């Protein structure tokens, strides 16, 4: 379903959504089983929580001691679970006429906590729940408009021995260099040396950990300068697709600070933080 097609009819039903993660709150402890201790006889009992309500006892459950209202909650002995709140923004494609994309809040508990990072495309299955909002802190009064959110039950972020036996077969091929150089950029024609140079950058040198000095890194830097119409930008895009991480920065569209890192402040936490530039 689309984020703009959820109606009241579809409340309390299992739906499937896809979107982009925008922001996630830190871990929130959610109580599961409460712990009570009698102030008089030092008797301890555990009571369950139903619908966010503690089934507190009126008086001590022991027979000899029955002092009413003498039970107290020991905060640090109650069982707890994990809770987290995420904000999901619909994919840019779904936007009908170029407006601000809508967002829907999600809740994930236990294992699914810290499963999706900020700025990732995920597909989430959960229950489309509804819940009241209290008009003010100090009253049971409720607003007539209900808040909508999704109770997530599954999240999907959108080597075998057989493969290893297969991979080891290619390495035996005598013309492996040509095969890989021809497969890295199928479309580009008669640039075998350029392709070979590009390929060796993906593999990279060898890493060395080195005390009594500094680390030595096997990273290769390549410059492709030549006449305009030749396939330079095409190879740039082709390699940009293959690599797992990379930023397609251009000329005059990037800044000195923008490449390295930007100093900023976090509004939510009100602390000085720094972002990661294109190079970082």
């Amino acid at each position: 379903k689309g984020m703009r097609e959820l109606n009241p009819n579809d409340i309390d039903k299992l739906i499937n959504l896809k979107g982009l993660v925008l922001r996630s709150t830190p871990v929130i402890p959610d109580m599961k089983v409460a712990f009570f201790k009698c102030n008089v006889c030092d008797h301890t009992m555990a009571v369950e929580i139903d619908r966010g309500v503690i089934q507190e006892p009126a008086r001590c459950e022991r027979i000899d001691c029955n002092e009413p209202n003498s039970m107290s909650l020991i905060h640090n002995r109650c069982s707890f679970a994990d809770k987290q709140v995420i904000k999901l923004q619909e994919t840019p494609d779904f936007v009908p006429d170029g407006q601000t994309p809508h967002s829907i809040s999600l809740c994930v508990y236990d294992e699914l906590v810290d499963s999706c990072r900020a700025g990732d495309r995920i597909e989430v299955t959960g229950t489309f729940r509804s819940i009241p909002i209290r008009a003010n802190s100090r009253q049971r009064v409720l607003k007539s408009l209900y808040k909508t959110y999704v109770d997530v039950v599954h999240v999907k972020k959108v080597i075998t021995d057989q493969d290893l036996a297969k991979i080891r077969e290619v390495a035996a091929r005598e013309d492996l260099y040509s095969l890989l150089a021809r497969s890295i950029a199928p479309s580009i024609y008669e640039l075998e040396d350029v392709k070979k140079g590009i390929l060796l950058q993906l593999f990279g040198g060898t890493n060395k950990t080195f005390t009594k000095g500094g680390r030595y890194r096997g990273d290769i830097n390549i410059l492709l300068c030549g006449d305009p119409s030749t396939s330079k930008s095409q190879i740039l895009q082709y390699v940009h697709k293959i690599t797992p991480r990379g930023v397609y920065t251009s000329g005059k569209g990037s800044s000195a600070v923008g490449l390295t890192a930007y100093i900023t402040r976090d509004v939510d936490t009100k602390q000085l933080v720094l972002e990661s530039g294109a190079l970082v």
Partner: peptide, 12 residues
């Protein structure tokens, strides 16, 4: 003159 009840520590 007054009504009082007592809770003993040994009862713990």
């Amino acid at each position: 003159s007054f009504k009082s009840r007592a809770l003993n520590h040994v009862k713990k």
